[PDB]
Amino acid sequence: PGDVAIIGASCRFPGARNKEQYWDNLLHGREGVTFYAKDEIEVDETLINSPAYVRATGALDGYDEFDPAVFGVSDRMAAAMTPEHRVFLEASWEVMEDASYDPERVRGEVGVYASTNPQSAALYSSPPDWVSAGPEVMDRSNAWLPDTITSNVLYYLGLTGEAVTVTAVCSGFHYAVHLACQSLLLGQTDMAIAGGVMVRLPQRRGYLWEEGRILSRDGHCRPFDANGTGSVLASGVAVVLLKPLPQAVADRDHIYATVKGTAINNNGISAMAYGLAQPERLSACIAGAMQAGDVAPETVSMYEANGFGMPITDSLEVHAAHLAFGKQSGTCSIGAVKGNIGHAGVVAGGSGAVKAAFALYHRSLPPTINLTELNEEIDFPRTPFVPQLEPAAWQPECGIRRAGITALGGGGYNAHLVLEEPPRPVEREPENRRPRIVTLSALDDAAVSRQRAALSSWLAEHSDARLDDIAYSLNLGRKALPSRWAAVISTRDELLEVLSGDGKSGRVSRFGQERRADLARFRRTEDGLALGSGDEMRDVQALTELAAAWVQGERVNFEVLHADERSHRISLPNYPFARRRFWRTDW
Amino acid sequence: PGDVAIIGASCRFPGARNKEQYWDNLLHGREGVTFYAKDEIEVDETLINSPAYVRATGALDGYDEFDPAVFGVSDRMAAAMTPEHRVFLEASWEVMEDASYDPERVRGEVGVYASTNPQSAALYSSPPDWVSAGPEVMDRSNAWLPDTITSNVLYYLGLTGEAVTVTAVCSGFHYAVHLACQSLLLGQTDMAIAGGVMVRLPQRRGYLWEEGRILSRDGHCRPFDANGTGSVLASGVAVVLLKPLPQAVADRDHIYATVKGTAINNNGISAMAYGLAQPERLSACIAGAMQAGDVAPETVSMYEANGFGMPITDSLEVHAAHLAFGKQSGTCSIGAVKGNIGHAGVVAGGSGAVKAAFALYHRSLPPTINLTELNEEIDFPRTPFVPQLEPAAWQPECGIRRAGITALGGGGYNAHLVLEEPPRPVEREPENRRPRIVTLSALDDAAVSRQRAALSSWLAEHSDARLDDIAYSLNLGRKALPSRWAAVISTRDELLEVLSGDGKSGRVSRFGQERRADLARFRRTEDGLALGSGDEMRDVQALTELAAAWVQGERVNFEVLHADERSHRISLPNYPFARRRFWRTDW
Ligand SMILES: [K+]
Ligand SMILES: [K+]
Ligand SMILES: [K+]
Ligand SMILES: [K+]
């Protein structure tokens, strides 16, 4: 009754600049950890020559890159913002795009719940000084405080709602999703942006190996392996857009998976060393999440573990999951994504949750890598869990696909969330052949051309995408920006041709160069221009003039254009951010 | 005897990127202080809106620019070096060029004495950590420690001698020049590099006015004015090359001025507030400097004062100078360069000293600016000093031109140095009409082209420069660098012709493209290739082969080329440093 749908997703991880790259890497079992030479590391002069220094890390490509003009941010402010502020702000923009929701036109309350690492801000620059209360002081505070990582999203995306920032160490992503779902179930918001960000500073840096501790000795992470010595430190970002399941189905959204239940607790007085799971407290967390979503352990066929790669910590976590599943659970696939990318800190739980969501969406199970000798002490044949050594189709005897993801952190933080595969797709009516308007807008002309190239490339990969879904998503899911482009077409092949080249071969492009659009033809609505009659909305000349009026900069009511058909929102390419490098120069 | 010659100079001050630009500004009474709008200052968020905040400073253009390849420095090391390390190192290279001395061919011991501000390094980056003793740690120490500002000059220029760094607050330049002269008079070195550097961090910054203090209320410095309220903070660098006067005349060097005497002391227990000159202690300093050089107060016709611009501080200094001059001194021109540029900290005494050296060299007196109401409390008609309101030719009733410069700082630091005009130029033998080789070398082709552009402009400005001096200075006073250019010409007008355009219209260019050089034509010497006869060294075709062999990278003995003539070293354009910005990214 309290299911929450994941209708948009955005992430960046070691070796992946977007979610499609991340899922493709997981499918092929790639390792995203980077190894450096001594001269490639320009910090830790005192440690670089130690025999225990491991020159390996999970780097985040473009951690210092940002496109402030798209957000209305000045260059001065972009350098003042911590890298976590910028990376999370850019991911929030992308997650609204992936769900095809224009924040300017969202009619409801949107909550932004995120988790961040305050240690990064303390290393990036000195904190704000509150000796005076001028507007330049407030700008500096909004650039540095972790409290405004979520607030700046509401402000710069044009949303209205509530913002909550939490700091929960290595359980950050799960705690954000947990609090977001409480906001939705109590009716405080209509949809929620939830995620976390982790940018380790210094970025290009190794670590010091110490025997018996969580950091790996060779730079490789080997979950559930007998020869595992730990993990690698990683950076990344992961954001999801959450919406109640009945509403997401009613609005014909694109659903990756649904959140059945979440649970949090703390080890408390029953404390362990770092990474060591206390069986009683962690199992209560795992069982509580399954109880919240009314799912029985017999129905959960995938378990995404924390999995540092240490024999003792991996053994305790598998034991805790066993206590929560019981004996009669059956069989379940177990894996740990940390073998692929390392320990991503605040967003470590996000890497597992995003992997499980895409696993449920594509009905595939990605492998766990760096596993050559199974840990005999765990005794997997005596447990419900089977290590996923190879990729495989997900066809459970249970009948339903459900996953559980666990996040462990320092300070005793525990968290577990349970996901279910998305609802079965409804039968679609055949697509009407009629002229449609498609729109693209960006900040400058060069970015619009990148959007056209990105859109044409996407069309080849997704040949089964309907045109009425494409136009509906582009027209109602993107912000209207100054440099604009539009076309009126009827088939997918016409769309591919007008996008090609300079993009000026379409009737709308030739219309705008010859004559200006006559607005007296249209009727004014509260949301913009509309056509005068229902018959006019199938006339090529009427639709061409309306699209040209939009290209000239007028506001068009796209809701009434698609009012007669029940199209679906689909996932389209993100904005092609021009990524200038920004870094503070004064401490 | 005990007189020390200034045979080379290099400086950068507010509004001047080199000494020629600096003297031209002083001659025209220009002010080099910069005034900013609020949005142009990106620091001091807590103060930018205060009514007492003055958006004025003496900026040092390119304080972050460096050309590490010219010095053999890596990009990583260039970012680790503090701006004072880079600026002073670049200035030492320039002072060797200005004096026409190639460090590879200097046979003697060179001392490097500099003054620096340790406050600047502590603001630029965290200090080195000595928990281990690796080579990367040693590189970081040499990049940060003030002790290595002088060592890096000796190492990176290829010199051998001694290096001494002193910290004497706002009298740093004088203390460096003072110690250099003791080093020369005791015979420990043959030439000495002396100077100071001041790079204020943050650079683009205003200041806070406090009533009754040294900082100006409107951003203008008005020395000796009744309405003066103080000075502005400035950054800069000034370096001079010192050599005993009898040797400098013997080696036909280029002499700006000579140092007659120097003196230092401290206020000690008889302390004052900042900027206030104690009459008894400062006068003893001024009198001691003139006694060291055996100069009588009757002969000093120019006094360059500290002159903050406050009536009370100006009154104490003019009185202290009066006590040292006595009654029988006569009349003397008094001025303060701080009215032009502000208080340059470590190098403030250098800005006045460099002004005095150029005044003696050009036999001209530049005016003191921002002076509208003379301070009536300073009974100027009853003193030997006359405020230099207008530029004027320097023709003293004394018969000899001598100047005195005072530098005051915090902590009681006092210093005074007395300069004399250079010796009268001797009658020169007429210039031989013969073919000459001229050479230019840098690290890449674009820099060599900049050298050609700089030399073509210089030839127009200095139409009285002899061609045999130009060739002598370029061939024997500049380091041979990988990217090379040479020409064989007989007059100044053909020299201007080969430099023009792409520089490939010359005789040497056609030889190098046609054939590679035949080394069998030349005789090998310990200093490089030489021509077979003295007649060949005056043959256009033989000189072309020798020059082309040099452009191809062979070593040429330029000493035997000029052995028959006794030419002079002259001042030619400095290296055209590629202006890349380097700044640290991790604290
Ligand atoms: K709980
Ligand atoms: K109308
Ligand atoms: K700066
Ligand atoms: K003394």
**Distance between CA atoms of A345 and A348, rounded to whole angstroms?**
5
The answer to whether A504 and A486 are in contact (CB under 8 A) is no
Which of B45, B134, B586 comes nearest A43 by C-beta? B586
Closest CA to B109 of B10, B184, B6: B184
CA atoms within 13 A on the CB side of A443: 11
- According to DSSP, residue B82 is labeled -
Burial of A381 (0-12, 13-18, 19+ CB in 10 A): exposed
Question: Read out DSSP for B13-62?
Answer: BTTBSSHHHHHHHHHTT----EE--GGG--S-TTTTT-TTEE-EEB--TT
- Give the closest-approach CA distance of A212 to chain B in angstroms: 24
Question: Read out DSSP for A507-525?
Answer: HHHHHHHH----GGGSEEE
Contact A45 B137 (CB under 8 A): yes
**Considering only CB atoms, which chain B residues are within 8 Å of A50?**
132
Closest CA to B279 of B248, B322, B244, B243: B322
Same domain flag for B464 and B474: no
Residue entry with tokens 């005068």:
A532
Same domain flag for A70 and A17: yes
Element (H, E) at A404: strand A402-408
Tell whether the torsion through CA atoms of B379, B382, B383 and B387 is positive or negative.
positive
Query: In angstroms, what is the span from residue A160 Cα to ligand 2's centroid?
Result: 33
Closest CA to B387 of B521, B251, B223: B223
**Distance between CA atoms of B585 and B582, rounded to whole angstroms?**
10
| Rounded (10°) CA dihedral B60, B62, B63, B64 | 160
Nearest-Cα residue of chain A relative to residue B41? A76
Contact B46 A137 (CB under 8 A): yes
Name the E strands within B131-230. 161-166, 191-198, 207-208
Closest CA to B350 of B244, B235, B265, B228: B235
Same domain flag for A258 and A186: yes
Beta bridge partners of B208: B53
**Distance between CA atoms of B99 and B574, rounded to whole angstroms?**
10
Question: Read out DSSP for A42-108?
Answer: -S-TTTTTSTTEE-EEB--TTTTEE-HHHHT--HHHHHHS-HHHHHHHHHHHHHHHHTT--GGG--S
Query: In angstroms, what is the span from residue A401 Cα to ligand 3's centroid?
Result: 57
Rg of the Cα atoms in chain B = 25
Number of domains, chain A: 2
Same domain flag for B208 and B349: yes
> Please, which residues have CB less than 5 A from ligand 3, an ion?
B 202-203
CA atoms within 13 A on the CB side of A183: 24
Contact A140 B45 (CB under 8 A): yes
Cis? peptide before A202, omega within 30° of 0: yes
The answer to whether B172 and B410 are in contact (CB under 8 A) is no
Tell whether the torsion through CA atoms of B364, B369, B373 and B379 is positive or negative.
negative
The answer to whether B304 and B340 are in contact (CB under 8 A) is no
Nearest-Cα residue of chain A relative to residue B583? A585
**Distance between CA atoms of A572 and A451, rounded to whole angstroms?**
10
**Distance between CA atoms of B264 and B286, rounded to whole angstroms?**
9
Does B126 touch chain A if contact means CB atoms closer than 8 Å?
Answer: no
Element (H, E) at B541: helix B540-551
Query: In angstroms, what is the span from residue B286 Cα to ligand 4's centroid?
Result: 10
Beta strand B191-198 with B110-115: parallel, antiparallel or unpaired?
parallel
**Distance between CA atoms of B311 and B307, rounded to whole angstroms?**
9
Does B585 touch chain A if contact means CB atoms closer than 8 Å?
Answer: yes
Contact B586 A136 (CB under 8 A): no
Same domain flag for A42 and A152: yes
Rg of the Cα atoms in chain A = 25
For residue A424, what are its two tokens?
Answer: 């079965």
Measured from the Cβ of residue A208, the count of other Cβ atoms closer than 10 Å reads 12
**Distance between CA atoms of A426 and B143, rounded to whole angstroms?**
68
- Give the closest-approach CA distance of A545 to chain B in angstroms: 43
- According to DSSP, residue B570 is labeled -
**Distance between CA atoms of A221 and A307, rounded to whole angstroms?**
9
Residue entry with tokens 């221009």:
A529
C-alpha distances (whole Å) from B103 to each of A73, A387, B72 are 51, 69, 15
**Distance between CA atoms of A556 and A519, rounded to whole angstroms?**
11
Q: Which domain holds residue A481?
A: 469-562
Measured from the Cβ of residue B466, the count of other Cβ atoms closer than 10 Å reads 15
Same domain flag for B95 and B68: yes
Does A586 touch chain B if contact means CB atoms closer than 8 Å?
Answer: yes
**Distance between CA atoms of B290 and B299, rounded to whole angstroms?**
10
Same domain flag for A275 and A377: yes
Residue entry with tokens 């007669």:
A564
Tell whether the torsion through CA atoms of A109, A113, A118 and A120 is positive or negative.
negative
The answer to whether B17 and B356 are in contact (CB under 8 A) is no
Query: In angstroms, what is the span from residue A245 Cα to ligand 4's centroid?
Result: 88
**Distance between CA atoms of B550 and B484, rounded to whole angstroms?**
8
- Give the closest-approach CA distance of B80 to chain A in angstroms: 10
User: Chain centroid to CA B108: how far?
Assistant: 21
Same domain flag for B267 and B141: yes
Nearest-Cα residue of chain B relative to residue A202? B586
C-alpha distances (whole Å) from B167 to each of A211, B118, B152, B171 are 47, 8, 17, 9
For residue A80, what are its two tokens?
Answer: 């003042």
Does A51 touch chain B if contact means CB atoms closer than 8 Å?
Answer: no
**Distance between CA atoms of A437 and A488, rounded to whole angstroms?**
5
- Residue type for B368, please? T
**Considering only CB atoms, which chain A residues are within 8 Å of B136?**
45, 48-49
Element (H, E) at A175: helix A172-185
Cis? peptide before B202, omega within 30° of 0: yes
Name the E strands within A110-224. 110-115, 161-166, 191-198, 207-208
Element (H, E) at B408: strand B402-408
Query: In angstroms, what is the span from residue A265 Cα to ligand 1's centroid?
Result: 5
Element (H, E) at B436: strand B436-442
**Distance between CA atoms of A289 and A303, rounded to whole angstroms?**
13
Does B137 touch chain A if contact means CB atoms closer than 8 Å?
Answer: yes
The answer to whether A394 and A365 are in contact (CB under 8 A) is yes
Which of B42, B46, B50 comes nearest A129 by C-beta? B46
Entry resolution in angstroms? Answer: 2.8
Contact B132 A202 (CB under 8 A): no
Does B372 touch chain A if contact means CB atoms closer than 8 Å?
Answer: no
**Considering only CB atoms, which chain A residues are within 8 Å of B583?**
585
- Give the closest-approach CA distance of B381 to chain A in angstroms: 50
Nearest-Cα residue of chain B relative to residue A581? B585
Contact A76 B47 (CB under 8 A): no
Same domain flag for A245 and A103: yes
The number of helix segments (H) and strand segments (E) in chain B equals 18, 23
The answer to whether B288 and B35 are in contact (CB under 8 A) is no
Contact B585 A583 (CB under 8 A): yes
HEC per residue, A246-310: HHHHHCCCCCCEEEEEEEEEECCCCCCCCCCCCHHHHHHHHHHHHHHCCCCHHHCCEEECCCCCC
Which 62-91 residues of chain B touch chain A by CB within 8 A?
76
Measured from the Cβ of residue B349, the count of other Cβ atoms closer than 10 Å reads 33
Query: In angstroms, what is the span from residue A546 Cα to ligand 2's centroid?
Result: 12
**Distance between CA atoms of A212 and A377, rounded to whole angstroms?**
17
Which of B43, B46, B583 comes nearest A132 by C-beta? B46
**Considering only CB atoms, which chain B residues are within 8 Å of A48?**
134, 136
The SS3 assignment for A330 reads coil
C-alpha distances (whole Å) from A446 to each of A17, A26, A437, A502, A552 are 21, 33, 22, 11, 17
Closest CA to B236 of B374, B105, B344: B344
Element (H, E) at B175: helix B172-185
Query: In angstroms, what is the span from residue A563 Cα to ligand 2's centroid?
Result: 20
φ and ψ at residue A183, rounded to 5 degrees: -65, -40
Beta bridge partners of A225: A374
Same domain flag for A344 and A482: no
Tell whether the torsion through CA atoms of A530, A532, A534 and A535 is positive or negative.
negative
Closest CA to A434 of A537, A520, A304, A553: A537
Q: Which of A44, A45, A130, A138 would you mutate first to test chain B, the one with the most B CBs within 10 A?
A: A45
C-alpha distances (whole Å) from B420 to each of A7, A336, B285 are 83, 81, 18
For residue A551, what are its two tokens?
Answer: 């290209």
Does A123 touch chain B if contact means CB atoms closer than 8 Å?
Answer: yes
Same domain flag for B106 and B76: yes
**Distance between CA atoms of B75 and B389, rounded to whole angstroms?**
48
**Distance between CA atoms of B327 and A343, rounded to whole angstroms?**
82
**Distance between CA atoms of B581 and B79, rounded to whole angstroms?**
9
Considering every ligand atom, which ligand is closest to the CA of B415? 4
**Distance between CA atoms of A234 and A176, rounded to whole angstroms?**
19
Which of A46, A139, A587 comes nearest B587 by C-beta? A587
**Considering only CB atoms, which chain B residues are within 8 Å of A142?**
none
C-alpha distances (whole Å) from B28 to each of A450, B22, B364 are 54, 10, 12
Does B45 touch chain A if contact means CB atoms closer than 8 Å?
Answer: yes
Helix boundaries (H) for B326-466: 338-341, 348-362, 445-461
Element (H, E) at B66: strand B65-66
Which of A39, A49, A132 comes nearest B134 by C-beta? A49
For residue B535, what are its two tokens?
Answer: 């007649």
Treating both helix axes as pointing N-terminal to C-terminal, what angle do B148-156 and B83-98 enclose, rounded to 10 degrees?
50
Treating both helix axes as pointing N-terminal to C-terminal, what angle do B348-362 and B19-27 enclose, rounded to 10 degrees?
80
- Give the closest-approach CA distance of A156 to chain B in angstroms: 21
The answer to whether A556 and A550 are in contact (CB under 8 A) is yes
Cα angle, residue A532 at apex, residues A530 and A537 outer, rounded to 5°? 75
Query: In angstroms, what is the span from residue B300 Cα to ligand 4's centroid?
Result: 20
- According to DSSP, residue B329 is labeled T
- Give the closest-approach CA distance of B84 to chain A in angstroms: 16
Question: Read out DSSP for B450-504?
Answer: HHHHHHHHHHHH-TT--HHHHHHHHHHSS---SEEEEEEESSHHHHHHHHSTTS-
Same domain flag for A67 and A126: yes
> Please, which residues have CB less than 5 A from ligand 4, an ion?
B 265
